[PDB]
Amino acid sequence: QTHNVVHEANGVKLRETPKEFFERQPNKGHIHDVNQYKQMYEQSIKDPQGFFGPLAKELLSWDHDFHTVKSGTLKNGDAAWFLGGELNASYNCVDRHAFANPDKPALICEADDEKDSHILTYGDLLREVSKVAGVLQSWGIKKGDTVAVYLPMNAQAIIAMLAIARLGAAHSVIFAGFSAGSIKDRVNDASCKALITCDEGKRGGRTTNIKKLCDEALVDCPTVEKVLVYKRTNNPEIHLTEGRDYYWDVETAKFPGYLPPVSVNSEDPLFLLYTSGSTGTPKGVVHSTAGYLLGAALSTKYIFDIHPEDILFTAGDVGWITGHTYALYGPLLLGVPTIIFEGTPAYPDYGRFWQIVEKHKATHFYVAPTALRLLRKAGEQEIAKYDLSSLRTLGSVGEPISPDIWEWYNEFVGKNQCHISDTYWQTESGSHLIAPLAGVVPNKPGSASYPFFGIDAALIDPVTGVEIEGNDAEGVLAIKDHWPSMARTVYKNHTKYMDTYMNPYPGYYFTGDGAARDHDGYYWIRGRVDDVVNVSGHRLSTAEIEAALIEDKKVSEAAVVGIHDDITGQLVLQVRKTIGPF
Amino acid sequence: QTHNVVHEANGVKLRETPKEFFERQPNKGHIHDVNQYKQMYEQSIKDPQGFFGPLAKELLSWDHDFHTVKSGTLKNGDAAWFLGGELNASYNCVDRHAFANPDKPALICEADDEKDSHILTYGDLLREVSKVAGVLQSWGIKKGDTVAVYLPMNAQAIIAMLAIARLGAAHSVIFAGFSAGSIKDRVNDASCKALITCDEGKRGGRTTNIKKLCDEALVDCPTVEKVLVYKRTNNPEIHLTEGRDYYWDVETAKFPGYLPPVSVNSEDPLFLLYTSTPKGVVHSTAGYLLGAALSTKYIFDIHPEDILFTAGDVGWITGHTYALYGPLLLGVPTIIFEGTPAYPDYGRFWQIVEKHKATHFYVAPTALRLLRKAGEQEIAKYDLSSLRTLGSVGEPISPDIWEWYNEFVGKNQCHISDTYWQTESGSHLIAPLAGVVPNKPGSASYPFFGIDAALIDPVTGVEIEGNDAEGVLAIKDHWPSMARTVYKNHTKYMDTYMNPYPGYYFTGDGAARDHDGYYWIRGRVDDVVNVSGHRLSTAEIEAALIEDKKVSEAAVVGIHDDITGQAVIAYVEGLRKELVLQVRKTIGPFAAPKSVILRKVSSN
Amino acid sequence: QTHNVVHEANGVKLRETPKEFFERQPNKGHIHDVNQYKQMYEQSIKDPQGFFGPLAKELLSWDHDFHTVKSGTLKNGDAAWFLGGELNASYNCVDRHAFANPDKPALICEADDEKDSHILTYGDLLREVSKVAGVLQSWGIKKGDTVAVYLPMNAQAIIAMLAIARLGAAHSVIFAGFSAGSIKDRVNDASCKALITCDEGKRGGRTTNIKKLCDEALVDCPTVEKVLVYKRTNNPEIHLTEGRDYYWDVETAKFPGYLPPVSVNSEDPLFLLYTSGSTGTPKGVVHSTAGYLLGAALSTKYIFDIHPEDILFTAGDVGWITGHTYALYGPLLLGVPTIIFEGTPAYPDYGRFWQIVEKHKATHFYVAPTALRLLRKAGEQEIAKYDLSSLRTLGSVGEPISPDIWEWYNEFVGKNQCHISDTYWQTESGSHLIAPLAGVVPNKPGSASYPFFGIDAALIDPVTGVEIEGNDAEGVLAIKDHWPSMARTVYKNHTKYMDTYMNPYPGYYFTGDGAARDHDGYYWIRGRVDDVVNVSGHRLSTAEIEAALIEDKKVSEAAVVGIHDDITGQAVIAYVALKEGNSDEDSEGLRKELVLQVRKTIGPFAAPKSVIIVQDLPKTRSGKIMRRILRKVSSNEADQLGDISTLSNPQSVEGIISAFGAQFGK
Numbered sequence A: 001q002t003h004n005v006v007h008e009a010n011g012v013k014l015r016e017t018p019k020e021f022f023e024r025q026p027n028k029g030h031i032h033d034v035n036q037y038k039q040m041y042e043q044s045i046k047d048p049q050g051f052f053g054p055l056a057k058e059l060l061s062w063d064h065d066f067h068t069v070k071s072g073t074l075k076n077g078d079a080a081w082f083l084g085g086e087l088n089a090s091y092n093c094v095d096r097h098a099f100a101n102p103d104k105p106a107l108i109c110e111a112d113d114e115k116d117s118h119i120l121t122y123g124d125l126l127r128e129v130s131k132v133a134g135v136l137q138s139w140g141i142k143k144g145d146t147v148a149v150y151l152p153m154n155a156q157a158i159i160a161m162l163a164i165a166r167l168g169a170a171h172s173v174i175f176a177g178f179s180a181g182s183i184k185d186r187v188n189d190a191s192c193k194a195l196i197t198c199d200e201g202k203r204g205g206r207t208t209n210i211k212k213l214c215d216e217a218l219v220d221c222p223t224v225e226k227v228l229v230y231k232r233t234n235n236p237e238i239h240l241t242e243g244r245d246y247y248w249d250v251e252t253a254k255f256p257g258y259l260p261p262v263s264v265n266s267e268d269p270l271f272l273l274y275t276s277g278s279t280g281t282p283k284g285v286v287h288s289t290a291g292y293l294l295g296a297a298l299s300t301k302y303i304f305d306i307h308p309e310d311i312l313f314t315a316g317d318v319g320w321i322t323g324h325t326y327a328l329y330g331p332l333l334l335g336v337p338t339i340i341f342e343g344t345p346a347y348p349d350y351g352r353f354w355q356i357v358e359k360h361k362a363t364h365f366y367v368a369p370t371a372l373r374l375l376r377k378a379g380e381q382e383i384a385k386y387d388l389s390s391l392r393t394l395g396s397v398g399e400p401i402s403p404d405i406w407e408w409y410n411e412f413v414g415k416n417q418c419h420i421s422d423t424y425w426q427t428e429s430g431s432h433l434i435a436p437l438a439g440v441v442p443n444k445p446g447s448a449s450y451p452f453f454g455i456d457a458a459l460i461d462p463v464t465g466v467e468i469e470g471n472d473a474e475g476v477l478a479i480k481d482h483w484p485s486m487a488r489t490v491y492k493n494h495t496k497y498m499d500t501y502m503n504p505y506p507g508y509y510f511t512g513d514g515a516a517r518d519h520d521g522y523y524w525i526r527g528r529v530d531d532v533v534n535v536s537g538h539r540l541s542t543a544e545i546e547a548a549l550i551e552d553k554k555v556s557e558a559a560v561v562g563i564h565d566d567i568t569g570q571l572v573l574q575v576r577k578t579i580g581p582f
Numbered sequence B: 001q002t003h004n005v006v007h008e009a010n011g012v013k014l015r016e017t018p019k020e021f022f023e024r025q026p027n028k029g030h031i032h033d034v035n036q037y038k039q040m041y042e043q044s045i046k047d048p049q050g051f052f053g054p055l056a057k058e059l060l061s062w063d064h065d066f067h068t069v070k071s072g073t074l075k076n077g078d079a080a081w082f083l084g085g086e087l088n089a090s091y092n093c094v095d096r097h098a099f100a101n102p103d104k105p106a107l108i109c110e111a112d113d114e115k116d117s118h119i120l121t122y123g124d125l126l127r128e129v130s131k132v133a134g135v136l137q138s139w140g141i142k143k144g145d146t147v148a149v150y151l152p153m154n155a156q157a158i159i160a161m162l163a164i165a166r167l168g169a170a171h172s173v174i175f176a177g178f179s180a181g182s183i184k185d186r187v188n189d190a191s192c193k194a195l196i197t198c199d200e201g202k203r204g205g206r207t208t209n210i211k212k213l214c215d216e217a218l219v220d221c222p223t224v225e226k227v228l229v230y231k232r233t234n235n236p237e238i239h240l241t242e243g244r245d246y247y248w249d250v251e252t253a254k255f256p257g258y259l260p261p262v263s264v265n266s267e268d269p270l271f272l273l274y275t276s277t278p279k280g281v282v283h284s285t286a287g288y289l290l291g292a293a294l295s296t297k298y299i300f301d302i303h304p305e306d307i308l309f310t311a312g313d314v315g316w317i318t319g320h321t322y323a324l325y326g327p328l329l330l331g332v333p334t335i336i337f338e339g340t341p342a343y344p345d346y347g348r349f350w351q352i353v354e355k356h357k358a359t360h361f362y363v364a365p366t367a368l369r370l371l372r373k374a375g376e377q378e379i380a381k382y383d384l385s386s387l388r389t390l391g392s393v394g395e396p397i398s399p400d401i402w403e404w405y406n407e408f409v410g411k412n413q414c415h416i417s418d419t420y421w422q423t424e425s426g427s428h429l430i431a432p433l434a435g436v437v438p439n440k441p442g443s444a445s446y447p448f449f450g451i452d453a454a455l456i457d458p459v460t461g462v463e464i465e466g467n468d469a470e471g472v473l474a475i476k477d478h479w480p481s482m483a484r485t486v487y488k489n490h491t492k493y494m495d496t497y498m499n500p501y502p503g504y505y506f507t508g509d510g511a512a513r514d515h516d517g518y519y520w521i522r523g524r525v526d527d528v529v530n531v532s533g534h535r536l537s538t539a540e541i542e543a544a545l546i547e548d549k550k551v552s553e554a555a556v557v558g559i560h561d562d563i564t565g566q567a568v569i570a571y572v573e574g575l576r577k578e579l580v581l582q583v584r585k586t587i588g589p590f591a592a593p594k595s596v597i598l599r600k601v602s603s604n
Numbered sequence C: 001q002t003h004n005v006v007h008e009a010n011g012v013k014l015r016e017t018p019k020e021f022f023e024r025q026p027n028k029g030h031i032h033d034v035n036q037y038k039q040m041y042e043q044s045i046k047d048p049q050g051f052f053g054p055l056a057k058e059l060l061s062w063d064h065d066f067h068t069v070k071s072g073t074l075k076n077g078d079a080a081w082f083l084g085g086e087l088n089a090s091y092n093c094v095d096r097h098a099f100a101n102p103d104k105p106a107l108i109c110e111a112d113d114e115k116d117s118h119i120l121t122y123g124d125l126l127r128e129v130s131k132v133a134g135v136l137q138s139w140g141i142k143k144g145d146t147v148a149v150y151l152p153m154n155a156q157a158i159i160a161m162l163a164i165a166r167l168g169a170a171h172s173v174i175f176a177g178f179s180a181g182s183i184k185d186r187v188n189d190a191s192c193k194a195l196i197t198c199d200e201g202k203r204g205g206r207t208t209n210i211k212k213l214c215d216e217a218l219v220d221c222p223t224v225e226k227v228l229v230y231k232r233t234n235n236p237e238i239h240l241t242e243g244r245d246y247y248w249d250v251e252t253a254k255f256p257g258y259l260p261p262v263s264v265n266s267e268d269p270l271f272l273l274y275t276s277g278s279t280g281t282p283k284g285v286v287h288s289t290a291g292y293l294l295g296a297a298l299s300t301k302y303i304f305d306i307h308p309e310d311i312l313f314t315a316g317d318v319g320w321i322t323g324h325t326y327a328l329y330g331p332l333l334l335g336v337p338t339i340i341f342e343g344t345p346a347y348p349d350y351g352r353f354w355q356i357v358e359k360h361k362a363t364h365f366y367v368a369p370t371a372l373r374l375l376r377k378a379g380e381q382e383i384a385k386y387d388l389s390s391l392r393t394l395g396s397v398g399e400p401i402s403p404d405i406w407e408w409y410n411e412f413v414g415k416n417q418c419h420i421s422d423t424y425w426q427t428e429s430g431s432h433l434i435a436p437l438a439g440v441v442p443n444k445p446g447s448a449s450y451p452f453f454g455i456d457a458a459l460i461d462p463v464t465g466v467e468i469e470g471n472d473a474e475g476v477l478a479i480k481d482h483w484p485s486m487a488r489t490v491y492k493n494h495t496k497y498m499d500t501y502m503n504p505y506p507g508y509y510f511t512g513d514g515a516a517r518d519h520d521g522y523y524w525i526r527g528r529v530d531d532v533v534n535v536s537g538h539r540l541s542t543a544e545i546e547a548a549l550i551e552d553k554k555v556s557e558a559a560v561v562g563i564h565d566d567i568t569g570q571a572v573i574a575y576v577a578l579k580e581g582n583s584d585e586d587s588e589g590l591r592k593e594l595v596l597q598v599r600k601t602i603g604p605f606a607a608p609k610s611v612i613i614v615q616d617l618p619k620t621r622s623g624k625i626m627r628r629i630l631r632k633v634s635s636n637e638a639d640q641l642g643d644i645s646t647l648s649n650p651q652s653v654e655g656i657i658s659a660f661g662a663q664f665g666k
């Protein structure tokens, strides 16, 4: 019972799901109890074909059937799922819900300033996506092209991603905080034919330089033929380069409210997302179409317990994977509304999150612990002014959640009435790897709990490289077989992909994290083993900041390390200009 | 019984279909009587899914099934039919019939001079279409491209259109009578990658300059990469530009008689057709084809044994729908007439009908008036007893012309189908079904399947219930063959058809409905601007302004406005307010212009 | 019983399949008896829809079903099969078998030197094909493009072909024996966007220049954007042109081991294979996808009696049609291992074929009679060193097999215990046309026997142009309807296709061969009627050789003809007249020069057996050369020239005769 290795586990009482969770859920839970979950998990590991085939058919709409559920091995880095099938991401995210119920809300958009907020129905979303896709189609964008998006977290970002997917092209989303150099790097690696951006952004009430950073970068991006610019502020003084830049409203007005979607293969790339890595310049993680979408829908449904009546508020940015999977694809695939928040938790005050939750009766809230630390320090008193009784599932993402914050999250936001899901995963996994299912798995504060369907977690001894049998163990966290939403390569550098994930421990997937497993099987994430730092949920490379500093001629040598920080979890102008303010 | 509004209907006896019609039709009619037609029509309006789904499966061959029969609304201009389905126009018009009976005639071509007439079987058509598609494919034409056609009404025009559709590209057919300026405008708006044409044309025994006008246009058409030139006259003096112009016979000889067709989406554009600044009406693939086949079958009573002679030009919608797509989809021969009704003499139409024993004849009243004036004696010289359905298209047919048509051509033995429709509708909207609907001469009669016809008051925009009424002719829901957009100007599409009377399709015509429900087309309306629900006449404002002695002349136009829908701009601070007050007291308070080629400058 | 026309058939005892064949056969045979074969054949002729439709569904994996089994006619040149259907060639050859059993051997690669041999499983092949296709995809290769392959007979050539097909593009394979000019001709006609090759080759233990010949040709191939070079010898001295040439290993390392295959239409072109004809320029025969693959699978399965347990050794090169169909597509479609031999039958000794068979326990062996003649002359002693008891089907391809060689093949290789399948067919047929099915059809040595499924064979009278009813006949060999794997066109020259195959005998396919049919219906191939030479199984154009000789400025005129050869079947004799040279000292000096001219223009294998220097070539009143005179003289039929008064230069004939006598053997 007492753990000599897993010190986190000693004397920690299991936390059962509160009664209010089950009272508030609109329908019967998808899994009755933890024992049914283990039966389903055991099948998803021993019999992936008989487990994932039927779910793929239930949760996704197929234009062509698949003939093989699963192919490939980690060691050969040739994993593939639902081979021979064809589908379209935007059809599954928009069309089929629009045909069923066109007036159902899809994008609940909360602007930096609430006066500018608006809601798009699934019918509205189909017309806007079709028109932007029509613009891209007129420009020669076609299956196989890549299109960059440089937009803040608002409706137009979702529409751009979905419009690119409609044509069979792959979107490459670039966080609005990146510098012109970071834009240049990503656009050139992917050889994007087109870019979608806006004139300016609004964050915390302050104007943001968007188009200007694009122009500075594009002088070195010869592959970009055309740019679509949305008028977020409609500032007249913002310059558009003639013959290359065109206005969103002007061009979409030229095209009809329906455009047929384009079928792609299960294993055609849905998108590229450039993550910072221990070695080298940022690398474009590639995700397939079928496997990624299934992983997104499946995890959204089962870990968060999402039903059609529910509303999900993921306080993330599509510049990162959390927005991709659980702000856009996960919820829309399931046909529920998703809340897209452009602003910050502090503007106009530290009750903004709670105003939104009360306003739209959100049932699920998904945020990074860094925000919880901020609200604990500055905004605790406002929580009580807003009605949060609509929530039943509260999620944590992107970094460890200390047991103290877990309790703060549970009581002050959850009112000790909600289920807390500490979701462990990474950009390369596509979706959740270890997380406690809402309404099924009791919680240990700070523990990611059991691994998800199709995730065969294991601990390896770093020095011997041998998998660690038995519980009460510590080691590098690895997976013993690939899973549907696993990233398939790094764009045009599959060798980097193999050397990073598959080759260090042959037969395994290397998460880059160390973890611990206790006698109950709960996993405790102990953090990166490599030189990758996590600052406020943002993944950074110590090499990239060291490179930015050395770029300055005055610098002889540079060395970067990470330390504990109570607000953010973990020459200055040179690093801001090389990488980004964050 | 007496009409107080629809004066045309007073004292008009219904004219039953003659017995010789049913004696001559090869099989039992597709609809038994007017009551069965009413049942089918009510379903096509109340239950479009359960009506059109089965017909789409019966009449068309699908490469991929559709999952939704009908989508969209007029007001959002996002109409779509048979979503998720894939098919090919040339496969449904050529391939499937060629496999069934390759020797059945497909294109009965009558040349300007009969010596050059010839017949192509469906097998022949498949080979010629395959070869032209092979030429275009080797040239890089692919799905998404547009290809212009500048050809007279002959086999090569049909072959080009089907070959372009075979690859998934959209053909944009340009009437051979158009000038170089008209060619340039259309080619550049569609950004065509290739052009198919001929060296010279023959009309009325006279040579027409075709390639020369193309060359004149292409100096300003940089998107045109290659031209395919047919040797219609084989004139040695006609020059071909090296590296751009290639001969039809030379290139088609290089490629085989089969080329796989390329599947497209139901809602992929089949073709662009520029209305007579010119705007490119776009038609979908599945919806347009179903409308063409369905109307041809039921309005005209077409069976596999029949032969159709549509005396129209593929430069216009009538040729597209009822000279090519309609009849070929159903697998019947179609007569493609290159020349004029007068050359070599004014009996040419009737010689053709006699020669090929055509059962169906479709012509415009303009031609009927000409032949009445100059060739009436010639009709009796020929055997026309093979005809049973006589169609009128494109303009009103007066009761006198209707009677002349019925007696001198029909011998009082045929059914007459006065077909009302437009380029944007793709196919028939109001027309009397052959053998089913008794007609009133000068009346198109009942609206067709999927066409929910209505009359709206021009001032209020409110639908006029009840019969013995007059108003703007509108449609209450979209239909499969309805045009989907104006090429790269969907705003003009909405402003023209969907915005003037929201929730309706605006035909631009006025009509009247009598106590029996028959519609009487009264012709184009004044096309009144709509500013925030107040409908205004630009002509009335020009007149009110001209009444002012200070005004030299006045010209008023309408443009799109983001707040009020349409805006009125007047071309002619004390005099501007004096003119605005002149318009308010002459016309009305809500008729004052927003401000005082003219449309494009106003729209910037 | 006695034949009055078909003398080959007189006094020829039928040879039943040995009993050992069925003992060695792993399962029940695919065909019950010859009567079942006759019934199936009749249905394949009278009811092609009900016969081939079901077989196409059994043997191929379809991405879209077909709606019409068969379309078009020979006379119109618009043949088509399985219309509306979609599939992918590399999926049916690799993916589907890899998913079933990833570890099963697929490519048994035997290198020029056995130390370098290796085996690729179907899983290995899927990853390698996926990676090469990934490189081509990154380079912009897409459905509709053509890609040239210039590689020896080894794994990388197979991988290249399958990777190109995976993307929906058509491969055009160029035999490694071709010179730079022949590469240039083929690459430019097809307008290939990319080329796949290697640095150097190994044959008979000697290094061959491969990339060097590509570089020479590519200076005049402006359509080629990028080249993929495999490191066969990894010789550092081989130069790669910057911006165009990239190494196979470096680029494939950038892309993953799975790439989704691209659906193509049944009638989208699978490949171009440039054949020589009676033209003087090679013509690119085009093959469809569905029909060709079905033909490959069907003939491999039924003519050779291939089961999943079997191992096929086709001793051919993918540079030619035999390698395409029966070294790559046939066996891989059926999911069995296939042996890819890079070297020669003689290196390191004349037992190499048999070493390979014994090493891998091959069950089927497929070779050209030219090789049999070589091993009979030089390597007969080697046979006894090897265990050949794993073989049961022995095939002959590409040229007539004399009854003596048929017996030699039967005794020393087969041990009088195997079935022998003399397969008649050609590049344009895609697959076997007339062949005795293994375990079903009794053999007459030297006879291809009965026509195969879907092949309605006929003999036409050379004089009347009328089909010959009844047996004991001879005439032009023609086919009365098209068949699935028939070539569909000549690339961008459909007129040459029609004039060559479909127009000469309207309503028929013209094989270019003459044949005879005996009282039993067995067909006896009597050889080309269109003056097309076959040297050691290589199809050559005498016109193309004349052109190469004329390129030499010393040459005034050239006339090339074919004669019988005891080693190579047919040999090429070149008669040359020189502009300004009657010098007898130059004699052999310029004869070698001319031979080298042919070697550098076309390739070493096209080199003439002999060059005859003459003062004048015999010509007509119009001035055309009379090649019949040269044929008869070279065949030692000097008599049988007949009246030569019709020549403008009858006196030239005597000089030709004496020139041949004085120069042929020396």
Ligand SMILES: CC(C)(COP(=O)(O)OP(=O)(O)OC[C@H]1O[C@@H](n2cnc3c(N)ncnc32)[C@H](O)[C@@H]1OP(=O)(O)O)[C@@H](O)C(=O)NCCC(=O)NCCS
Pocket (backbone or CB within 6 Å): C152, C175, C176, C177, C203, C208, C315, C316, C317, C320, C321, C322, C323, C344, C345, C368, C370, C371, C374, C397, C398, C536, C537, C538, C604, C605
């Ligand atoms: C017995 C046989 C193997 C003789 O092979 P060989 O010993 O190479 O003799 P060849 O007659 O081919 O030699 C002629 C020239 O071609 C060259 N050659 C033949 N194949 C070659 C190849 N793949 N790569 C390079 N050169 C080649 C030889 O090197 C030789 O050049 P050389 O005069 O400098 O020596 C003969 O049967 C053969 O060439 N095989 C082809 C049979 C066949 O399958 N035909 C295709 C039917 S579709």
Ligand SMILES: C#CCOP(=O)(O)OC[C@H]1O[C@@H](n2cnc3c(N)ncnc32)[C@H](O)[C@@H]1O
Pocket (backbone or CB within 6 Å): A275, A320, A321, A322, A396, A397, A398, A399, A400, A401, A422, A423, A424, A425, A426, A427, A428, A448, A511, A512, A513, A525, A527, A528, A534, A537, A538, A539
């Ligand atoms: C998600 C996401 C965005 O993906 P990414 O930006 O790749 O960051 C992922 C990395 O963040 C850390 N992390 C993420 N979730 C947890 C967790 N529940 N408990 C402890 N650590 C966590 C790990 O180090 C991951 O590798």
Ligand SMILES: C#CCOP(=O)(O)OC[C@H]1O[C@@H](n2cnc3c(N)ncnc32)[C@H](O)[C@@H]1O
Pocket (backbone or CB within 6 Å): B317, B318, B392, B393, B394, B395, B396, B397, B418, B419, B420, B421, B422, B423, B424, B444, B507, B508, B509, B521, B523, B524
């Ligand atoms: C058709 C066609 C070509 O289409 P289009 O060239 O657009 O012309 C269409 C216009 O012609 C007039 N019209 C057409 N048919 C009739 C008819 N039966 N009775 C009275 N008027 C008719 C109307 O004004 C239409 O809008």
Ligand SMILES: C#CCOP(=O)(O)OC[C@H]1O[C@@H](n2cnc3c(N)ncnc32)[C@H](O)[C@@H]1O
Pocket (backbone or CB within 6 Å): C321, C396, C397, C398, C399, C400, C401, C422, C423, C424, C425, C426, C427, C428, C448, C511, C512, C513, C525, C527, C528, C534, C537, C538, C539
């Ligand atoms: C195959 C192949 C090579 O293909 P290809 O290069 O097209 O040459 C085709 C010519 O080969 C000769 N041939 C082929 N097989 C036989 C045989 N079994 N018996 C007699 N002659 C045969 C004929 O002359 C063919 O027309």
Ligand SMILES: [Cl-]
Pocket (backbone or CB within 6 Å): B277, B599
């Ligand atoms: Cl206009």
Ligand SMILES: [Cl-]
Pocket (backbone or CB within 6 Å): none
């Ligand atoms: Cl005013």
